[model samples]
Target: AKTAAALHILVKEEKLALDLLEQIKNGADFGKLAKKHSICPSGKRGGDLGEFRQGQMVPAFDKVVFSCPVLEPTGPLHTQFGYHIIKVLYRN
Candidate 1:
């Protein structure tokens, strides 16, 4: 197992990305929010990406995974997959 928790949301629109960011900034529940809006199947579980070691993810995702502040949300990061809102949920 890795030393951190990570999750991501996918969406088709930049406008929706900004809206989700706003909800996060306003203290909305990240998981619940993801369930409502994310396009990924993982969104069914509120976007839990589970634990993984460094380099386990794609380069764009790996950057956020390894370097983003622990227990906090990061981005509106754009990947070929789509718009993402990642959160580092916890760490060891």
Candidate 2:
């Protein structure tokens, strides 16, 4: 099974997610923004979703984790949990 260490900023609104992506693209600290704005309980830890296998996360998360670029923000991707700005640190 594939595995990845992921971080993400979860928000209730697409607008909020989009704004966060803007900040990140401009070199703003992702952790700081996540701490301030993410609605996920993981927000307190700067959106550390930690490590998981291929099927551990939802389909949307699975797509991003296994197929997307590493160390770059990859959302306001949609999910049952809501919109998320995903960052994959490492994967294998």
Candidate 3:
């Protein structure tokens, strides 16, 4: 179907994004960090961006979402909106 799902923590700065990435790697709960630190409105729902198709997001973000390893945080990615730490869920 060429669709994918992902969750992400969006921050205004790369440093904050990197910090969150470290915590996520250290077993810190992603949803908690999202709720606490993500500036994007999706953070209210654990940074869930729900399901989406390619081309629906910024080019850089779409690239990662479609190609990143599932369930592992891939981050500090830069985009026009800000830095993002993304976790791919699944693709179909």
Candidate 4:
């Protein structure tokens, strides 16, 4: 089984997630943005979702974490929790 580490910002709106994504692309700090805007408790830790197996997350999130290019910000991926801006850290 594969595992991965990631950081993400979870927000209630797709628009906010998109805006954050733009900021990230423009060289803004993801952890800072996540600390300020994310709704999930993990935001307190800079949106760091520590290493986990591929299937541990929700199906949509698991797919992205496993397949999206490592260390690149990606997604306004929607799940029951809300929209997420994901940056895959590593996988193995």
lDDT of each: 0.72, 0.73, 0.71, 0.72
lDDT of 3 at 5: 74
Model 1 pairs whose backbones collide: none
Quality of model 2 by C-alpha lDDT: 0.73
Tens digits of per-residue lDDT for model 3 on 1-92? 37667776778877776677787769778767887786555667637767777667667866676456666557768878888677677766
List TM-score per model, in order: 0.74, 0.76, 0.76, 0.76
lDDT of 4 at 47: 79
Residues 1-92, candidate 4: write the lDDT tens digits. Answer: 37777776777877777777788769788777888786555667637777776666567776676567777667877778777668787666
Alpha carbon lDDT of residue 23, candidate 2? 77
- Runs off by more than 4 Å, candidate 3: none
Clashing residue pair totals per candidate (backbone < 3 A): 0, 0, 0, 0
Error (Å) of candidate 3 at residue 71 is 4.1
Error of 4 at 39 (Å): 4.7
Q: Sorted by TM-score, highest first, which candidate order results? A: 2, 4, 3, 1
- Single out the weakest 10-residue window by summed lDDT for candidate 1: 49-58
